[PDB]
Design a protein around this nucleic acid. Sequence first.
DNA 1: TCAATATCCACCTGCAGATACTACCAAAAGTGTATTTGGAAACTGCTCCATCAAAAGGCATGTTCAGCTGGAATCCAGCTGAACATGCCTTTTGATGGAGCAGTTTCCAAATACACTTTTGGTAGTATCTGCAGGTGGATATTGA
DNA 2: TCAATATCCACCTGCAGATACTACCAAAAGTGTATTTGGAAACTGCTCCATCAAAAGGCATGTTCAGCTGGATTCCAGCTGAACATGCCTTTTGATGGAGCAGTTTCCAAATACACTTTTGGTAGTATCTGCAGGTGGATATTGA
Lengths: 92, 92, 205, 79, 100, 99, 89, 91
Amino acid sequence: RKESYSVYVYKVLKQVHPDTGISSKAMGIMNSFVNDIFERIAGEASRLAHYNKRSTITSREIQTAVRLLLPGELAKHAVSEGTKAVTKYTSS
Amino acid sequence: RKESYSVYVYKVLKQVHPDTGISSKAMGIMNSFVNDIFERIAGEASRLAHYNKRSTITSREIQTAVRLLLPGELAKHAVSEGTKAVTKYTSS
Amino acid sequence: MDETVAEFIKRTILKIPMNELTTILKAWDFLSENQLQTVNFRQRKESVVQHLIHLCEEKRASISDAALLDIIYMQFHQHQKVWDVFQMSKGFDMKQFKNSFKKILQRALKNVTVSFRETEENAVWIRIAWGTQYTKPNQYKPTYVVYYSQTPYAFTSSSMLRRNTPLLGQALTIASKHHQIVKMDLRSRYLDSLKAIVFKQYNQT
Amino acid sequence: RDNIQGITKPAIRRLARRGGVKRISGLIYEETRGVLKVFLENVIRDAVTYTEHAKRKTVTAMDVVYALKRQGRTLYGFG
Amino acid sequence: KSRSSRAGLQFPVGRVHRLLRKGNYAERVGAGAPVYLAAVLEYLTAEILELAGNAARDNKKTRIIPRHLQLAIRNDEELNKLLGRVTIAQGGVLPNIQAV
Amino acid sequence: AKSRSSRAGLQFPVGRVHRLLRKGNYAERVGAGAPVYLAAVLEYLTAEILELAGNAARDNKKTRIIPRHLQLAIRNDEELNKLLGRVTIAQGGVLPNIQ
Amino acid sequence: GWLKEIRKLQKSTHLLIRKLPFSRLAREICVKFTRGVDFNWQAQALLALQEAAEAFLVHLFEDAYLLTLHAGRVTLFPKDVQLARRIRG
Amino acid sequence: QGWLKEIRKLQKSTHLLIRKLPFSRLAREICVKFTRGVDFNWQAQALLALQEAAEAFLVHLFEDAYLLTLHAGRVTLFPKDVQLARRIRGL
DNA sequence: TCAATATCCACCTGCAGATACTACCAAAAGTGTATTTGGAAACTGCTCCATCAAAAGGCATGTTCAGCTGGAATCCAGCTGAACATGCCTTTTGATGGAGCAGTTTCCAAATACACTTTTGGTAGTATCTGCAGGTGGATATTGA
DNA sequence: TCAATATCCACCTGCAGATACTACCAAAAGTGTATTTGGAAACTGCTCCATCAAAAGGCATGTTCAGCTGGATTCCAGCTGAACATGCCTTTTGATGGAGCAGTTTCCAAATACACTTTTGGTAGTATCTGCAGGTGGATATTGA
């Protein structure tokens, strides 16, 4: 009945730091982190489509929201990653 | 093609200060004022229904949002006015 | 390449109808026909231009190539601009004209960009992007000139940027075998119509 | 000329006086210019994103208002 | 037979309904929400306009301008709290000098 | 048969993100590529923070991450602190700072 | 007297920075984010930006002169502008 | 000394500094003044959340305010410092 | 306190830029009537966790003293504001473009529904292992000498 | 500089709580497939409102001075911290019932669709009329004495 992001956080952790664990209090913080950024990005993407009279949210709205929210080099790398993901999703 | 709240602001003004006019720059400020409060109240009402797993926005959500946003005595009077409006709307 | 030329080329290409993009690209010839065959011209325009821009990045494109592309674009879309006529009187090979024109403008103004392309009937198309003694040129407000060497006539486009017309006229008059210039009583959006009447007057005076 | 030396001493003195300031040190005129540049960079960056998204080459007032509203600053008199 | 008249209001009940429906606030919207919200908006509008007209009267004028709105807002303890992260065009500041 | 996270090359879920976007009253329609982009962004940010936190844990000679380490990571970084400046980490403490 | 100028400038509402310098600066900043393209600017957008900037600066000066007096001074120092920004966030 | 050892020790730690029963008692007393005079129940995680938030608020305020003692050439914390910090923050 | 000079208020006149008032219109939008559907309220039951008690001892409280610091008074030199003469940059105006905004077409990507795998969350149960506390044991600065 | 005392720092031991792992399962959630539909891209085109130059006069620039303030020094009394001895209040643990949460009915309220009437936004052409600028007359505070 309850759902979370813990599985995927654990995978990513074993992918960057294979020797390192994580406590239960900390994964709550990480789950809260993921829920917050989702809400922010989707909220900005909702408005851009309303401002421009669009009824559909696409990857362009998410990209623009990423540019607006995230600071500096972090936005640059996030844009690169998302673009690659879409690129190799389409080519399958 | 463009729409605004100027008609109703002018009515309210002639209802509180019959001798007094209003300039065009100021009514822009008032129109901006009305659009801002609408967005805030409706945004809070959207979340309360999501937090509690409801698909409908009612007068109770608006009332709670009014209590949360507005400070002190101002919320009290706003609640009174809205309750009276609904009461005499239903009785017709 | 520089981030300022990538945007220029992207903006230039996004203006071109899909019905004739391949013809323009072939005339430009910067990209090889194999690279063109590599591309898909059916997906939406943004992805197509992303691919073509990546191809340009693999190579090394300079502001000269983009200026050539812009010149080629205007050869097809002449009607976008209003064209005015100039006449020269009181009177060199093509290379001397090119060098003299370029050197005149470069002497008057420190920062400029000039480009030429030939065309039938001994025509030369010129694109100028104006700068100053302190600032870089503007690539999005240029000036285009059509000059026919075997004639004293020169046709000019109406820029949203004045303050350089007399210098342009002086450079035209000096680089060529003439010493004065004037403006004719003809102006319209249709270059070919001006052309026809102008050479009708030229051949039948 | 550097386009920020066009923000002059008298203008800064006037803003300070409207803020109630009696005396001003000579090192306040360069500090204020940096503050202003930072503010403008932050607002304009977001304004340009909103209008490039819409595929325009013209910055409108709504783009500026949206940017400010993001930054935590809400401006009424425009639309 | 209009909804604003049935409720005793000057503000538009139908327009508020349409704007709630089109704004992606929820999948459904009830019938008392627009009237309740319109009434709240009217209350706040009139509450501001009263003080602005009073400030105009104090300044010996018959027409309201943004300066008067600013004075009204910043001299009222609650409206300032509601509108404390807001700047009003052509409003200026409140006079304030202080001894050291 | 095949998932969409795998086509995209991701660990985060692309179906769940789609579901949450549709159920959140964000817009009438939702495209195919939006969830992919968003999941990729979230994965990137998680990995960044976890890397920094594991480094902080190792410096303190520990094998397990706790909120202290995330706080140190976030406040020692000039960008994550700007993204998370209005945020308080439970059981995280403060940075040592005298004077 | 400083006292007459403060009183006069607190009754007024007009803008204090001149238009063309502000426009030049704002266009100089824009061109760095647009990658060489000279964007156009509505006339009602520059006024918005100017109103916002002037408000920001006035309120900052207020907050800082609150800190000059805390220290027993009358003269405004950069020392005092920096600290107000830190505390505001 | 003794103040420096204590400062170093306390910045190195994470635990809560106010005792729990007093905070609970105060929060309940405040709640009862709302609710129209009826006593609500509280989950435990709720009181811990509130306590964490409060201690964070106070520590950060003390940080912001000891910057104004040194501005004034002092070493001792006074109440005017806290008042001015709250004013400048906008609270 | 004297007092002239700005300066402060107040009143007046003039005018012009902006607000109210009519017409009109016609496009968009809101209202009224039936019909169907499904979301949420009302009722019942269950079990989880939050209130409420009673012992133990560890942290808080109170008193006193020594020293550190805040605050007030001098004094000196740096530096900001005020005034005046001058000239350069901003404001205002008129003329063209070029880009935004509205219109038409069509095609590609999204919703919709149904059938089929698969993955994730929860529950026993296992065990194991990381780190915290304790204590030994070596070795450094420190404020009183 | 000396150094015992804290104090720091490291190192080793033991164990208890919390982590990680395996198995089951089942359900609910995601995937694949086919159909239909509607939003948005692509291309035209036209009118608005943005940009570019020019002419001049008003605000800014530069120099000097003198009066005010910032900053360092000295002195003294108030007030904070540290230490030590009590004891009172917090913490931990355990039986108990009240309230949250899930499941079932149903019924009232919202969405959908069509017709019809009302309202609001924009333009043309007015006509006021309110507020600002300049002009003049009367009256006081502060500059210096």
